[PDB]
Amino acid sequence: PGVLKIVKVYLAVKRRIQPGDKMAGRHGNKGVISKINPIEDMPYDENGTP
Amino acid sequence: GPEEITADIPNVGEAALSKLDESGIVYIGAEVTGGDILVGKVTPKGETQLTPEEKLLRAIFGEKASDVKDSSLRVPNGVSGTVIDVQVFTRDGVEKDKR
Amino acid sequence: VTEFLKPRLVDIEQVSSTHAKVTLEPLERGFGHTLGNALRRILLSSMPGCAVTEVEIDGVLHEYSTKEGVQEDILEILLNLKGLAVRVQGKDEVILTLNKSGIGPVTAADITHDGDVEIVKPQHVICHLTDENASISMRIKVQRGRGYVPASTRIHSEEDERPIGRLLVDACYSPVERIAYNVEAARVEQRTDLDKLVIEMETNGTIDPEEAIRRAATILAEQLEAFVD
Numbered sequence: 001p002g003v004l005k006i007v008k009v010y011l012a013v014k015r016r017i018q019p020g021d022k023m024a025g026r027h028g029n030k031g032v033i034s035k036i037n038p039i040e041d042m043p044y045d046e047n048g049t050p
Numbered sequence: 051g052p053e054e055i056t057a058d059i060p061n062v063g064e065a066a067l068s069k070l071d072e073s074g075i076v077y078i079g080a081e082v083t084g085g086d087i088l089v090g091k092v093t094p095k096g097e098t099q100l101t102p103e104e105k106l107l108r109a110i111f112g113e114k115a116s117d118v119k120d121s122s123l124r125v126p127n128g129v130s131g132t133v134i135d136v137q138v139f140t141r142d143g144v145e146k147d148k149r
Numbered sequence: 150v151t152e153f154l155k156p157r158l159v160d161i162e163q164v165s166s167t168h169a170k171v172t173l174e175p176l177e178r179g180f181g182h183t184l185g186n187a188l189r190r191i192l193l194s195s196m197p198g199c200a201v202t203e204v205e206i207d208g209v210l211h212e213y214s215t216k217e218g219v220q221e222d223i224l225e226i227l228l229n230l231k232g233l234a235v236r237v238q239g240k241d242e243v244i245l246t247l248n249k250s251g252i253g254p255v256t257a258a259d260i261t262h263d264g265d266v267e268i269v270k271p272q273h274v275i276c277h278l279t280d281e282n283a284s285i286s287m288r289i290k291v292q293r294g295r296g297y298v299p300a301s302t303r304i305h306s307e308e309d310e311r312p313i314g315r316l317l318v319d320a321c322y323s324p325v326e327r328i329a330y331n332v333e334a335a336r337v338e339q340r341t342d343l344d345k346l347v348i349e350m351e352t353n354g355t356i357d358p359e360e361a362i363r364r365a366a367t368i369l370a371e372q373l374e375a376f377v378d
Binding site: 077078079080081083132133134 | 210211212213214304312313314
Binding site: 008 | 052055074075082088089123129130131132133134135136137138139140141143144146
């Protein structure tokens with residue numbers, strides 16, 4: 001009775017990880033996203049695969 | 051008086067009305083930033099006397115008369131992004147169907 | 150210096166259209182690793198290449214909506230195309246336009262590939278139309294850049310711009326994004342045993358590999374001297 005009409009609008013906003021993200025592992029090991037350096041900083045494999 | 055959505059927000063900047071479509075609500079497909087106003091409902095306001103100063107204002111500005119209070123839907127603070135969809139359910143007895 | 154034996158690149162190999170392997174004459178130890186490091190940095194990060202900056206379709210706005218017939222949506226199309234790369238000339242801000250009608254597989258032949266918009270990998274999974282009445286035409290601005298960035302950066306530059314319909318697109322822009330520098334001890338017989346360096350560089354087609362080697366090592370000299378002051 002109060003409202004003659006209602007207009008519901010839903011907006012979808014994306015989201016990528018950031019300083020402060022929380023990952024989890026199925027072995028119950030979890031963690032906070034702490035520091036990401038340039039990909040160069042990653043140790044290089046024997047084939048260099050960082 | 052009923053509050054209806056027609057983008058006739060009193061004291062509304064053009065860019066604000068430049069997003070809402072004719073029915074106060076806006077169209078579909080782009081993004082929205084900040085506290086952008088989405089649907090413009092106008093709350094009815096009480097009337098007054100002949101009000102010579104207000105009469106002069108209406109003769110100067112007019113089209114407001116302090117009759118429509120801005121009851122517009124606006125984006126929340128810290129809320130911005132793309133829009134999934136909108137839906138209007140109108141009670142029986144109201145058949146606007148403007149959009 | 151003292152018999153520095155400045156070497157030169159030799160037997161630079163190019164296996165495919167999207168990578169190369171450059172061998173080099175030998176050099177000293179305790180520096181070849183550092184030199185290769187600097188080279189990989191200047192080739193991959195500060196890497197002049199091409200990517201996609203703007204997208205558009207008359208019926209398809211910023212919202213992630215699947216085009217008629219096209220199985221993938223706007224975000225999904227962006228993803229599927231992202232698996233490839235496009236070419237612009239020495240001039241940046243080129244535009245490619247993928248347009249196709251029918252129901253056959255969607256690929257890059259029916260896309261704007263010019264003398265300043267070039268295509269090499271022309272059969273990607275591009276969400277072919279499924280309805281006969283559909284005829285898809287999406288236009289992606291493919292410009293030239295160097296470094297990773299999001300799409301909200303261009304909000305200030307395109308505020309009265311980027312109106313309802315123009316899609317602003319981001320990128321990660323490391324036009325090499327993969328280059329391996331390996332220092333070994335070989336290619337020295339008469340003098341001190343020396344370390345030869347191999348660069349396994351690789352791009353998505355945006356630029357030439359030996360060109361990236363020259364650019365990176367030029368930057369290497371440039372910033373190398375800057376320590377003088």
